[PDB]
Amino acid sequence: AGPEMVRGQVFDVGPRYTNLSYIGEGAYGMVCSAYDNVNKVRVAIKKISPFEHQTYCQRTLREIKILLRFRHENIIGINDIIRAPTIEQMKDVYIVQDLMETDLYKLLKTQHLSNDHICYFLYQILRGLKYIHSANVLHRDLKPSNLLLNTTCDLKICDFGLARVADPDHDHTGFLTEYVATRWYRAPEIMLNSKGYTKSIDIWSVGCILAEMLSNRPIFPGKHYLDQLNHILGILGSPSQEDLNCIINLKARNYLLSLPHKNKVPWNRLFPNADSKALDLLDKMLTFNPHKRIEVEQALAHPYLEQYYDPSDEPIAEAPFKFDMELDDLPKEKLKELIFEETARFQPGY
C-alpha cells in the first residue's frame, strides 16, 4: 500500500493518478502510463529529476514553457504537472500528457513502412514543424524516438528540452559536449559550430528521419562526430569550399577539406525501392550547405506530399515564442524558481 514504485523509483502522482505501468525512459525522464481517476482514461506521465544539474533544469524549463504555450494537432500537449508544494521540497517534476501508443524508433524496429504510411507521417512531421518554426523556435533534437504515434496513424512531436528561439548570433557552447542518447540526426554545422544555428538544422533532421523510414537503417550513424561526418561525406560526396565555409573553426574546416575526395551516391542507388518523389524531396533536405536546404513551407508544397497539401489547414503560432530572460547563464537555483513558478497553475486549489 502507498505511493507506487516503477522500475525501482517512486512515482508520487497519487491519489489522482494510479495503476502505473512502465513505458520507457529517455536520457532524462522515465515515462509511465497511469489511470486518471478524474477523467477516467489512461495518460502518460514523465518523471524528471533535474535540480542538481543546470542543463537538466534548462531542459525542464524549456520543455514546460514551450509545450504549455504551443497548441497544435501534431505537437504533444501538457495537461497537468505534479510537483511538491514548496520549492524546498521539490526534487521531481511529473509532466502529464495524452498517452500515445508508441514512437517511431520503436515501430521501425518491428516493421517496414509502406509508402502510404511514410508519406502521411512525413506530412504530419512537417505540418508540426511549420508551427514550431512559425514561433521562431528550433526543436534542435528531432529523431524517431520523439515522434509519437497511434494505431490511427496520428503523429505528435514531443521532447522539447533542447528547443531554442532562433538566434544566429547566440553562441552556446555546451551543446556539443553535453550527453544525448543519439547524435545521428544532427546537421553537420551543429556537430562543429557553437553558433549560427538556423531552422535548417531541423530540416536536416527530418531528412534523416525520412531516409530511415525508407530503409529502416539510420542514414548517417557513427561513433562520434568525425565518424558521422565521414558517413555524410560518403553519401553526399565532398563538400565544396563554399559548402564548408559555414564551418567556423578553421582547423575543422581544413581537416574536412583535406579528406579524400568522395563522389555523391545517387539516391536511387541507396534506396532502389523508394518513391522517386520521396527521393527528390530527400535530396533537397539533405544538403551540406544549410542555406541550400529546402525550408518547411516549400517542403509541404513538394509533389510527394500533394494529397495532403492544404495551406488553409496548416496553423501557425500567434506570435514568436519568447523566454523572459536568457536561460544559459542562470544558476540552477534561479531555474528551479522559474520552474516552480511555471508549474504553480497546476497545484491543487490554485
Binding site: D116, Y120, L149, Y308, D313
Partner: peptide, 17 residues
C-alpha cells in the same frame, strides 16, 4: 503495433474531402 491505413486518420480524412 498494427497501423490502420492512413485514410482512416482524422487529418487525412479532412484532406480527402
Amino acid at each position: 503495433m498494427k497501423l490502420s491505413p492512413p485514410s482512416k486518420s482524422r487529418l487525412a480524412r479532412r484532406r480527402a474531402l
